Structure 1
Amino acid sequence: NQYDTNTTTWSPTGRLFQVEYANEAVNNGSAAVGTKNKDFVVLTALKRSYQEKVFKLDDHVGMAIAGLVADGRMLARFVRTECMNYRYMHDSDNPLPLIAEIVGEKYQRHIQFAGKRPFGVGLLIAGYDSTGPHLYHTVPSGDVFDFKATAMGLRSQAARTYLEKHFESFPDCGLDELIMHALKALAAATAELNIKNTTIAIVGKGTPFMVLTEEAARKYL
């Protein structure tokens, strides 16, 4: 294949292959799920010799990653820095729609120039601001999707199949049923779920972004 080596080469059918291949890094990462109701967002992740998959980005926002961890960390440092500057200048939370836009724009600069490599990582970003809860998914091509529920990583089609049956009932759910739907979706992409291989994180109304401890996660696993 004469068109699959560089990010700066269009193929004769109008495709960009190096960007499709970076997107396979994501699809072979370990699975992660997100869901939301009227006032919360939940993320869950398979973290099995502990491997860090969830990161806090500010008081009101965090994310899960899938794919290359060192690229994950580089994006986490960028978003952290952006949220700190916003709060310095305004004394309030950086709005979630603006976070999702600057991230998208940073991915895209790395798919158009020969001296840069695409980021091989997918994020689920969860947060809570003045207009409510938000859940975004970002991918190596630079696209950003705003979701009521989704899943990324290995065998995440099964998780997505489960969420398509139940998601229309999630607005009325309480925080406890919402956490349970998120673990049953992650279970479909899988050994079983214990407190030592599964992360649960939450953010919402009156709740800063937090990761449950092993004590608090016992109640659900």
Structure 2
Amino acid sequence: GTGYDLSNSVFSPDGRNFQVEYAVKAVENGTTSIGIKCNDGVVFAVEKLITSKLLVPQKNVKIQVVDRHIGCVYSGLIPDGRHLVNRGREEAASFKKLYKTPIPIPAFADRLGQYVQAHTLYNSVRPFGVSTIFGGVDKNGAHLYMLEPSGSYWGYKGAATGKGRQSAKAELEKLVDHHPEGLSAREAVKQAAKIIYLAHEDNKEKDFELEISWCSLSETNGLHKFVKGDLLQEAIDFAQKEIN
């Protein structure tokens, strides 16, 4: 459908906002990132493609923390994701200043959804070219959400985005089938690494670095922390072992 896709706020005769649909095409080109909701927290994993050996390992972090209990991972236009996360940090700080409590994840997800959606209202602005998997632990459990360029978001047992989303979603579905009682935080980290490695088979042309993050009540006391050192290497070893 041409003619109606040159502007951001225009409905096509079918009611479809094409520019937002084109923004989704930007997301589908990004590196695959997933989020797994465990029985007491959430786990985030992102594939970081190694463009060249000259990138210093472990410095180009792509998972972001908001306040202290929300972690955000996104795929698509990385600058757009940072713009969205910068707003979330402002929204989270504003909520804490006025209400004194850390912003609830369902409340935070709405704050971001209103912002992302507001970018589809006017033709003087462009839609976000990122789908953001975000979540954390709040007063009433763990929450995992996923935004879209249109501003739509839902709660997920496990979310996947980026180029390997179709591959990753297959293994996320297997996790919920095999573990309906709830997956443990430590096992979720190992499974998160395995899913990213499997999803990378859609990007075999280039090497990648796995980055994991997670926020569990029992293990981080409800705060968002990165996987590093021994725990990261066990996940990498497990992911390679299953691949081999």
Relative to structure 1, the CA distance from residue 170 to residue 36 in structure 2 (aligned partners, 3 Å threshold; closer, same or farther) is farther
Deviation by residue 1:80-112 (Cα, 9 ceiling, x = unmatched): 112112222233211111111111111111112
- Shift of residue 70, structure 1, vs aligned partner: 1.4
Partners in 2 of 1:69 and 1:173 — Cα distance? 30
- Shift of residue 175, structure 1, vs aligned partner: 2.1
Q: Which runs of 4+ in 1 moved over 6 A?
A: none
> Where does the alignment leave 5 or more consecutive residues of structure 1 unmatched?
none
What aligned pairs does 1:19-98 form with structure 2 within 5 A after superposition? 19-47=20-48, 48=50, 49=55, 51-98=60-107
The counterpart of 2:192, out of the listed 182, 185, 190, is 182
1:219 to 2:229 alignment: no
SS at match of 1:189: helix
What aligned pairs does 1:145-156 form with structure 2 within 5 A after superposition? 145-156=154-165
Partners in 2 of 1:158 and 1:101 — Cα distance? 28
Partners in 2 of 1:78 and 1:98 — Cα distance? 14
SS at match of 1:199: strand
Identity of aligned residues (%): 31
Partners in 2 of 1:155 and 1:172 — Cα distance? 24
CA contact (8 A) 1:83 1:94 kept: yes
Q: Aligned AA for 1:199? A: E
Query: In the alignment, which residue of structure 2 is the partner of 1:8?
Result: 9
Structure number having the greater helix percentage: 2
Q: Aligned AA for 2:227? A: L
TM-score after normalising by structure 2 = 0.84
Partners in 2 of 1:36 and 1:132 — Cα distance? 11
Partners in 1 of 2:195 and 2:180 — Cα distance? 13
TM-score after normalising by structure 1 = 0.92
Query: In the alignment, which residue of structure 1 is the partner of 2:241?
Result: none
Query: In the alignment, which residue of structure 1 is the partner of 2:176?
Result: 167
Deviation by residue 1:123-179 (Cα, 9 ceiling, x = unmatched): 000210011000000011110110001210012101101111221315433222211
Q: Aligned AA for 2:198? A: A
How many aligned residue pairs are there?
Answer: 218
- Shift of residue 187, structure 1, vs aligned partner: 1.7
Deviation by residue 1:49-101 (Cα, 9 ceiling, x = unmatched): 25432111111111101111111111111111121122222332111111111
Partners in 2 of 1:8 and 1:173 — Cα distance? 42
